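Input record (Table S2, row 261):
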Amino acid sequence: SAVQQKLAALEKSSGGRLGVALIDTADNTQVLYRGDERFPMCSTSKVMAAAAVLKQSETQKQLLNQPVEIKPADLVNYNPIAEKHVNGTMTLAELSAAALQYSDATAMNKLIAQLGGPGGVTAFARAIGDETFRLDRTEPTLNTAIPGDPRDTTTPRAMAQTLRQLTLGHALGETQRAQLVTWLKGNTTGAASIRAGLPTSWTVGDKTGSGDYGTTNDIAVIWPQGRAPLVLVTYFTQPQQNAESRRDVLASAARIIAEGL
Ligand SMILES: [Cl-]
Ligand SMILES: [Zn+2]
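Output record (chloride ion complex):
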């Protein structure tokens, strides 16, 4: 496809390895670039953890309003919300909101712990049919993206399918699916990533991520005008450990998709 040649050219000029999956829910067609290669997830795994806690809340009444103690030992690499609550509490809803909308790493670690560790997040992935996602570590090590290391990786194909199931399908209950979509739509970190490659009138929920090896990621559900929603995942990582983040490459991938399909 013309899209696949533009994505190959984008990668060639990019200084890294690019992975893209787009699902068009109008006809359930898929466009993939390196769609079955593993990529480090970095912050984008926060969507799985928040979703897994939402699933817990379907049978545990008021779980989202349960206070969770924030302790000094919980603070990790980026704690914009939790660092205002040490020796206080945050509810699981507030922790999910902080992880998703501010990428709060302490909040992520509280969610992972609420699920019984990284295996609990992975078990939720398996329960909703994702055989590929794996979470192996916790913050701050989730931000380390060693090339070839399969820990804390997924494939673009699998993340797009899972994101679709969570936000547009039936993986979650109706109230929970709406809450996840609301959280994603209120993300504060995405202005320079997929959103920067889309028409401003299209509605977007997204979760970015970044880590070392210049790893720069974003996963999005898009509601265009005039057509059915899209699910777009863009993963990018580079050969040098201290490579610079390339949110602009993800914006380019989003523009190719927005204009070519
Ligand atoms: Cl992370
Ligand atoms: Zn992190």
